């Protein structure tokens, strides 16, 4: 795969080039956010197709990864957009919501603060978002065929490429070897929090009777082949 | 203040190894075949006994007791199921296809079916054991990972402002940096190149994200069965910590 030949700088360029635009709300709160997330999803699918290595996978494995990652991806984008607005979640430039408008809100806000405190760079962000896409679903492949084993191996190799890329960016920025490893750890541990927030978000989508809103396997499959 | 941040990599490993809890047994000779209730009974009984020893273990994780009692409990509240789960996965590593809940309670995938919605978590736990096996996870790495879960899982949900809260969060991040250094030291000692060290560290920390997911699914299923009574309260944890 061409993905496994990329330098750190090419991987970053690829991910930066693939970035979706920031969309605006049409501007009911749940109505606006749902409409926005639906439009974001179309772009996420096209973004995913541009993440190096992703289209080397079967369609089935592409969908499984997107099924497992979609809410975490939306969330990390939200946190990134909100970074320079302490106390507020910038769902869109015309939909900026404060804490008063809560437990999920608070978790999202804590994550933005952590990104701010770490001075998270755009190049690091796109790497993290790609890790989420490839990592979130990799441990729940149901098949045990040779093909499935080959697919999981490929994902882990691309994930290794993204690690190397993160370390390269840090070394370029002048971090010592020790600082490089510590910052890599700090970034990857936040992913564990993003998973948690996705899980809480999902359970809250269900709790509001919005089970209709999560993209099915079939929806994603049809969107991928489109 | 605290000498936790002054430990070397070797002292940190020694501390964590020394702090490791015992392996407990399940209730002896239960009525086999299991019902849903009796399976849940055995696991609950086991988890409850394990919890006491986890708290003793936690108190020996360097830096943990430098935190307020409130922050200690918050961390344990957020991590307890992930901690039980990673212990289960480690115990089961050398038993492919099976979950070694205890030396006298080894369960294969088919026995997960004896409780509704159980088999999917069973499957995720088994996939994780396979991943640990494939990576040849070492005991010294495992104790590092288990400590990361304890300190990391709840750190982002001290939403508190204030100097004390900032100091607490900073201390946790510093101890977490110390555990990272320790993991890297172990890898370098074992002869890994710099590139291999960073890649293995990443692979280990990314599995933590799957353990979180499994904890969340487990919890949602505990609730779904009407077992909210099974999760340790703030008060229980606090009383066990001060004991
Ligand atoms: O977890 S919540 O449900 C959910 C997750 C997040 O917010 C909601 C959502 C969403 C909404 C409709 C969808 O179809 C799909 C996703 C998100 C999202 C959307 C776009 C995007 O780019 C990033 C994230 N939530 C919690 C909090 F408020 F804190 F964010 C929430 C609750 C009630 C509200 O009234 C508003 C939001
Ligand atoms: O995630 S589940 O809840 C939960 C995880 C694991 O099984 C259950 C459990 C537990 C049980 C009762 C407790 O009070 C507290 C913990 C575990 C445990 C116990 C001791 C230990 O050292 C390690 C793990 N689950 C598990 C799975 F599905 F994989 F079998 C599950 C789901 C639906 C049904 C039945 C069980």
UniProtKB/Swiss-Prot annotation, chain A:
Q: How is it modified after translation?
A: Phosphorylated by cyclin A/CDK2 and CK1. Phosphorylation probably enhances transcriptional activity. Self-association induces phosphorylation. Phosphorylated by LMTK3 in vitro. Glycosylated; contains N-acetylglucosamine, probably O-linked.
User: What effect on the protein does mutating residue 73 to C have, as reported in its record?
Assistant: Loss of transmembrane localization, no effect on peripheral membrane localization. Impairs activation of estrogen-induced activation of NOS3 and production of nitric oxide. No effect on binding to ERES
What family does the Swiss-Prot or TrEMBL record give for this protein? Belongs to the nuclear hormone receptor family. NR3 subfamily.
An example molecular function term from Gene Ontology annotations: beta-catenin binding
Q: What is known of its domains?
A: Composed of three domains: a modulating N-terminal domain, a DNA-binding domain and a C-terminal ligand-binding domain. The modulating domain, also known as A/B or AF-1 domain has a ligand-independent transactivation function. The C-terminus contains a ligand-dependent transactivation domain, also known as E/F or AF-2 domain which overlaps with the ligand binding domain. AF-1 and AF-2 activate transcription independently and synergistically and act in a promoter- and cell-specific manner. AF-1 seems to provide the major transactivation function in differentiated cells.
The function of this protein is: Nuclear hormone receptor. The steroid hormones and their receptors are involved in the regulation of eukaryotic gene expression and affect cellular proliferation and differentiation in target tissues. Ligand-dependent nuclear transactivation involves either direct homodimer binding to a palindromic estrogen response element (ERE) sequence or association with other DNA-binding transcription factors, such as AP-1/c-Jun, c-Fos, ATF-2, Sp1 and Sp3, to mediate ERE-independent signaling.
Record GO biological process: androgen metabolic process; antral ovarian follicle growth; cellular response to estradiol stimulus; cellular response to estrogen stimulus; chromatin remodeling; epithelial cell development; epithelial cell proliferation involved in mammary gland duct elongation; estrogen receptor signaling pathway
The consequence of residue 62 to H is: In ESTRR; results in highly reduced activity
Region Interaction with AKAP13, residue ranges: 1-226
Residue ranges the record marks as coiled coil: none
Protein name per UniProt: Estrogen receptor
The residues that the entry says bind 17beta-estradiol are: 40, 81, 204
Spans annotated as Self-association: 1-226
> Would the keyword Zinc-finger turn up in this protein's UniProt record?
yes
Q: Which residues carry this modification: Phosphotyrosine?
A: 217
Task: Supply any other comment.
Answer: Selective estrogen receptor modulators (SERMs), such as tamoxifen, raloxifene, toremifene, lasofoxifene, clomifene, femarelle and ormeloxifene, have tissue selective agonistic and antagonistic effects on the estrogen receptor (ER). They interfere with the ER association with coactivators or corepressors, mainly involving the AF-2 domain.
One CC-aspect GO term: cytoplasm
UniProt domain NR LBD: residue ranges: 7-226
Q: In which tissues is it expressed?
A: Widely expressed. Not expressed in the pituitary gland.
Curated annotation (Swiss-Prot), chain B:
Phosphotyrosine: modified positions: 234
Where does the NR LBD domain lie? 8-243
| Expression across tissues | Widely expressed. Not expressed in the pituitary gland.
Positions of the region Interaction with AKAP13?
A: 1-243
Does Disulfide bond count among this protein's keywords? no
Detail which positions bind 17beta-estradiol. 50, 91, 221
> Per the record, what is the consequence of mutating residue 61 to E?
Has higher transcriptional activity in the absence of wild type ER. Inhibits transcriptional activity when coexpressed with the wild type receptor
Q: Which GO terms describe its molecular function?
A: 14-3-3 protein binding; ATPase binding; beta-catenin binding; calmodulin binding; chromatin binding; DNA-binding transcription activator activity, RNA polymerase II-specific; DNA-binding transcription factor activity; DNA-binding transcription factor activity, RNA polymerase II-specific
Q: What is its main location?
A: nucleus
Q: Which UniProt keywords apply?
A: Activator, Cell membrane, Cytoplasm, Disease variant, DNA-binding, Glycoprotein, Golgi apparatus, Lipid-binding, Lipoprotein, Membrane, Metal-binding, Methylation, Nucleus, Osteoporosis, Palmitate, Phosphoprotein, Receptor, Steroid-binding, Transcription, Transcription regulation, Transmembrane, Ubl conjugation, Zinc, Zinc-finger
Q: Which domain of life is it from?
A: Eukaryota
Give the region (Self-association) as residue ranges: 1-243
Q: Which disease is it linked to?
A: Estrogen resistance: A disorder characterized by partial or complete resistance to estrogens, in the presence of elevated estrogen serum levels. Clinical features include absence of the pubertal growth spurt, delayed bone maturation, unfused epiphyses, reduced bone mineral density, osteoporosis, continued growth into adulthood and very tall adult stature. Glucose intolerance, hyperinsulinemia and lipid abnormalities may also be present.
Concerning its family, UniProt says: Belongs to the nuclear hormone receptor family. NR3 subfamily.
Protein name from the UniProt record: Estrogen receptor
Q: Which residues of the full protein are shown?
A: 304 to 546 of 595
């Amino acid at each position: 795969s061409l993905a496994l030949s990329l330098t750190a700088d090419q991987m970053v360029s690829a991910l930066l080039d693939a970035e979706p635009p920031i969309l605006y709300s049409e501007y009911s709160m749940m109505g606006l956010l749902t409409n926005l997330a639906d439009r974001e999803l179309v772009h996420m699918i096209n973004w995913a197709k541009r993440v190096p290595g992703f289209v080397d996978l079967t369609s089935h494995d592409q969908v499984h990864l997107l099924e497992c990652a979609w809410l975490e991806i939306l969330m990390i984008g939200l946190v990134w957009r909100s970074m320079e607005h302490p106390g507020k979640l910038l769902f869109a430039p015309n939909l900026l919501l404060d804490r008063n408008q809560v437990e999920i809100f608070d978790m999202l806000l804590a994550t933005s603060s952590r990104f701010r405190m770490m001075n998270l760079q755009g190049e690091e962000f796109v790497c993290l978002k790609s890790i989420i896409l490839l990592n979130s679903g990799v441990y729940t492949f149901l098949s045990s065929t040779l093909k499935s084993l080959e697919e999981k191996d490929h994902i882990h190799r691309v994930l290794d490429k993204i690690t190397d890329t993160l370390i390269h960016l840090m070394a370029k920025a002048g971090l010592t070897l020790q600082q490089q490893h510590q910052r890599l750890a700090q970034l990857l541990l936040i992913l564990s929090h993003i998973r948690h927030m996705s899980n809480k978000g999902m359970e809250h989508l269900y709790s509001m009777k919005c089970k209709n809103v999560v993209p099915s396997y079939d929806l994603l499959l049809e969107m991928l082949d489109a």
